[PDB]
């Protein structure tokens, strides 16, 4: 299926995934498509944090859902 990832700037990318795909793997498709290192990526769904070690199916992500990409903060 295809899903959408909306960036912080509001730019929307189309991704090609499967409900078996992991969050890790989803980040790899993003990296491949927008050059963003996976260790910077954090995936949000309608406000809900998608845990790094999990799968789309765990969070019932449907065809054409929109995911939000936020950044891992690096505070000292």
């Amino acid at each position: 299926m295809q899903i959408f990832v909306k960036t912080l700037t509001g730019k929307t990318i189309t991704l090609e995934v499967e409900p078996s795909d992991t969050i890790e793997n989803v980040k790899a498709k993003i990296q491949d498509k927008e050059g963003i290192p996976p260790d910077q990526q954090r995936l949000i769904f309608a406000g809900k944090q998608l845990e790094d070690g999990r799968t789309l199916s765990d969070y019932n992500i449907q065809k054409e859902s929109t995911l939000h990409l936020v950044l891992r903060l690096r505070g000292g």
Binding site: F4, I44, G47, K48, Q49, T66
Partner: peptide, 18 residues
């Protein structure tokens, strides 16, 4: 937890999602 607005009041009056 919630990620998208700082305002607890916005989450009660409606946030905009696709």
């Amino acid at each position: 937890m919630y990620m998208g607005t700082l305002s607890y009041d916005n989450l009660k009056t409606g946030v905009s999602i696709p």
